[PDB]
Scaffold this active site. Sequence first.
Site, short mmCIF file in Angstrom:
data_model
loop_
_atom_site.label_atom_id
_atom_site.label_comp_id
_atom_site.label_asym_id
_atom_site.label_seq_id
_atom_site.Cartn_x
_atom_site.Cartn_y
_atom_site.Cartn_z
N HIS A 109 0.85 -1.22 0.00
CA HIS A 109 0.00 0.00 0.00
C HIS A 109 0.88 1.25 0.00
O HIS A 109 0.59 2.17 -0.79
CB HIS A 109 -1.00 -0.01 1.14
CG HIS A 109 -1.84 -1.23 1.16
ND1 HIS A 109 -2.51 -1.62 2.28
CD2 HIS A 109 -2.12 -2.14 0.20
CE1 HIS A 109 -3.17 -2.75 2.02
NE2 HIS A 109 -2.94 -3.09 0.75
N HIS A 162 -9.16 -1.75 -4.98
CA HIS A 162 -8.05 -2.10 -4.04
C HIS A 162 -7.09 -3.12 -4.68
O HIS A 162 -5.87 -3.03 -4.48
CB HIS A 162 -8.57 -2.58 -2.70
CG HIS A 162 -7.44 -2.72 -1.74
ND1 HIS A 162 -6.90 -1.63 -1.09
CD2 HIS A 162 -6.66 -3.78 -1.43
CE1 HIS A 162 -5.87 -2.02 -0.38
NE2 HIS A 162 -5.69 -3.34 -0.57
N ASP A 202 -3.11 -2.61 -5.01
CA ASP A 202 -2.12 -3.65 -4.62
C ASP A 202 -1.19 -3.90 -5.81
O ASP A 202 0.04 -4.01 -5.60
CB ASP A 202 -2.78 -4.98 -4.21
CG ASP A 202 -3.37 -4.99 -2.81
OD1 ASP A 202 -2.88 -4.21 -1.92
OD2 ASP A 202 -4.30 -5.79 -2.62
N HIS A 241 -0.49 -11.28 -4.71
CA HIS A 241 0.91 -10.86 -4.43
C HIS A 241 1.87 -11.87 -5.06
O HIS A 241 2.88 -11.42 -5.72
CB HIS A 241 1.11 -10.66 -2.93
CG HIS A 241 0.20 -9.62 -2.39
ND1 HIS A 241 0.16 -8.32 -2.90
CD2 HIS A 241 -0.75 -9.70 -1.44
CE1 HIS A 241 -0.76 -7.62 -2.23
NE2 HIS A 241 -1.34 -8.44 -1.34
C1 LIG Z 1 -11.67 -8.41 10.94
O1 LIG Z 1 -11.29 -7.50 9.89
C2 LIG Z 1 -10.36 -7.90 8.94
C3 LIG Z 1 -9.93 -9.21 8.75
C4 LIG Z 1 -8.98 -9.51 7.77
C5 LIG Z 1 -8.46 -8.49 6.98
C6 LIG Z 1 -7.44 -8.80 5.96
C7 LIG Z 1 -6.84 -8.04 4.98
N1 LIG Z 1 -5.91 -8.80 4.37
C8 LIG Z 1 -5.08 -8.41 3.22
C9 LIG Z 1 -5.97 -8.61 2.00
C10 LIG Z 1 -5.31 -8.49 0.63
C11 LIG Z 1 -4.29 -9.63 0.41
C12 LIG Z 1 -4.58 -7.13 0.52
O2 LIG Z 1 -5.05 -5.99 0.68
N2 LIG Z 1 -3.36 -7.23 0.26
O3 LIG Z 1 -2.72 -6.03 0.12
S1 LIG Z 1 -6.51 -8.63 -0.62
C13 LIG Z 1 -7.72 -7.52 -0.32
O4 LIG Z 1 -5.88 -8.34 -1.85
O5 LIG Z 1 -7.06 -9.97 -0.59
C14 LIG Z 1 -5.97 -9.97 5.00
O6 LIG Z 1 -5.29 -11.03 4.74
O7 LIG Z 1 -6.90 -10.03 5.97
C15 LIG Z 1 -8.90 -7.20 7.19
F1 LIG Z 1 -8.46 -6.20 6.45
C16 LIG Z 1 -9.83 -6.92 8.16
ZN LIG Z 2 -3.93 -4.47 -0.22
#
Ligand SMILES: COc1ccc(-c2cn(CC[C@](C)(C(=O)NO)S(C)(=O)=O)c(=O)o2)c(F)c1
Ligand SMILES: [Zn+2]
Length: 299
Positions: A78, A237, A241, A264
Amino acid sequence: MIKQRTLKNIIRATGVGLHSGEKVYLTLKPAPVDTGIVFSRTDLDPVVEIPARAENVGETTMSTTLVKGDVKVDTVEHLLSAMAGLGIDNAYVELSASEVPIMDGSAGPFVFLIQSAGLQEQEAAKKFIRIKREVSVEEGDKRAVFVPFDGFKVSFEIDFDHPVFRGRTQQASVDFSSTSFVKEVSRARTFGFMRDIEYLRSQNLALGGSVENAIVVDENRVLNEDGLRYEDEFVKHKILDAIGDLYLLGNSLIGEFRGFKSGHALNNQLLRTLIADKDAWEVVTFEDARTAPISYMRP
Ligand SMILES: COc1ccc(-c2cn(CC[C@](C)(C(=O)NO)S(C)(=O)=O)c(=O)o2)c(F)c1
Ligand SMILES: [Zn+2]
């Protein structure tokens, strides 16, 4: 001439690691030409510095992690997306813990802090990686591609297989010839599904995750009282990423990225395949910004 940029002033922020839940202090500092972006663990003696480069990516589970031996800097994507969006070539990123602070889950707080500090043009040509050939990597139903393009364009498509999307495959394209990174991408927050809580607990992940710094979905409900920042926030989002992950090339791209359920891991595999295929790319500079296929905001 398109010039390298660094920070004009230091930036300081405090927050928590999305994954670790640890309190972390962040300092962004100016750096000389051709430094690139360098993370520093300043809680360690001696300090451990990790260049933000594809070759230093070590884990790609639920974030992009930089690794030097036993030392990690987790969740760089980010902040690096903010730095790519604003065209920052050179900076030191000092961290008091193993993970960049999640802030509000988006790149918004980073672009605001950086643009508040201001940028400094440096007396050196900005180097770009220009895509000359198509480069594709796939694993299962996941695909990530670079295509030659005179500019910078990102496409993402994902079937989340989740009721909150009411049966709709999500898709978005952004072309930085018209799209504002700041207005249209930077505010898109990370997200979590309550159905992945078992697994995340079992990998000790997302310890800092809440409605405070992420979209939280429970089957049909967005738990966030104030809702979404964009109709298509989830897929914007993924684009944010992908912009962060691509910046681990170490130079801005002239080309197109297309993501198909890529994460990723596949994003990094694409960088590695690209770097190995030297027929597919070249380093270019622009002595005259007026004929360049990209532009940046005033510094
Ligand atoms: C109780 O609230 C929560 C629980 C889990 C998360 C969460 C966020 N992430 C990261 C998610 C990912 C991998 C991301 O932003 N990467 O940069 S994504 C949206 O691409 O799939 C994760 O593994 O868990 C959260 F943001 C909030
Ligand atoms: Zn992200």
